[model samples]
Target: AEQSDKDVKYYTLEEIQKHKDSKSTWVILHHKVYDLTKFLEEFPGGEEVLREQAGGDATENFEDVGFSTDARELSKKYIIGELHPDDRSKIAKPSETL
Candidate 1:
């Protein structure tokens, strides 16, 4: 099976969050994943995008972010590890970003 060009990158919630502190811009986030690697310094809506979405289990919120089926399917490409259940508390406060 071959994927289309648009279906190249994808990631899980935890995987995407891990890159919040990343310095690379190639990391992409479309569906459930939030690619803050490139947008961290110049986040259009500030840290709100990370705060609101990174708060808790945001499976449903993916839709609010305009994630389509294909994009969602792409998420599997970047799923590196399990989505830790306790990671949410670590992101509760924005100060953790520092």
Candidate 2:
């Protein structure tokens, strides 16, 4: 089936690991996957750091940053999908986005 941009897409850890480069990147925050490739430099901290942490789940690193309301809001623009339901961190939001 097909899904809209606002709709969630489920991805496996293996899949996330494959998009670890600047050309195509993905990150899991709060169990949600976000594709930051387009906005690589848009990240206030810079792209180098994100690239270094790519291909890995960085829940701890993300939380430690204490992102601002603006940064938080901006991140949503990059949202692509989400971590699998088996992550056990969230209620059944079920990656369909909306």
Candidate 3:
């Protein structure tokens, strides 16, 4: 499933916030927006904690947890798009991009 820049969608912070709910939850991790509605019921730790951070950047908590590499890789499947460049400044920068 290769995606081209032209086909990729970009969303503003305000736009992302609209999805903060069980019906449609989204979170930002590593500058990318992820639709976690499908993952809620499947999450290992339970959905409550995951839903708590919905519609907002979860990078800090995500990175702090030091999830296994597999967990990080699993997240790629949910990535819908990245934070628009104009809104990038709102996110915290990890020392390394990778």
Candidate 4:
């Protein structure tokens, strides 16, 4: 399952890269970070995209090439889908909802 928005954890560039190398980690795009180790086989594109972006830094290129929009949207979806219950509980008012 994807991580929750409220529970989402953001990592520094180095941390993200380290996670990508682990057996339990899966990189989505060139510089896109995701904890898809559990979702690997079930990932939308499987491991193909992951392999394409592995072993190098693609952040600058990805943004410079104008692909950041799609990548960001996908990341947002993943985070929202995995939102933590505590975070959800904190949104007690309509104005508090995002």
lDDT of each: 0.38, 0.56, 0.58, 0.37
Compared with the true structure, what per-residue lDDT tens digits does model 2 show for residues 1-98? 12355578875544555554677566676567766565566567566766645545445443333255544665666667776656424422234472
Writing each residue's lDDT as its tens digit, candidate 3 over 1-98 gives: 22356655675555655554655666677557765666665656555676656656566543333255644665677777766665556534323453
| Candidate whose lDDT is highest | 3
- Residue-level lDDT tens digits of model 4 in 6-47: 454533333233444335343333323444443334445454
CA error at residue 94 for candidate 2, angstroms:
24
Q: What is the Cα-based lDDT of residue 22 in candidate 1? A: 40
**Which candidate order results from sorting by TM-score in descending order?**
3, 2, 1, 4
Error of 4 at 92 (Å): 37
Question: RMSD, model 3, all Cα superposed?
Answer: 7.1
The true-structure Cα RMSD of candidate 1 reads 9.5
lDDT of 4 at 44: 57
Clashing pairs in 4: 3-82, 4-82, 4-83, 5-79, 5-83
User: Which residue pairs clash in candidate 2?
Assistant: 8-96, 8-97
TM-score on alpha carbons, each prediction: 0.33, 0.57, 0.60, 0.32
Worst 10 residues of 3 by lDDT: 89-98
lDDT digits (tens) for residues 16-66 of candidate 1? 444333442122222333433333344354444444454233354433343
Q: What residue runs in model 2 are displaced by over 4 Å at the alpha carbon?
A: 1-6, 43-45, 58-69, 87-98
Which rank order by lDDT, best down to worst?
A: 3, 2, 1, 4
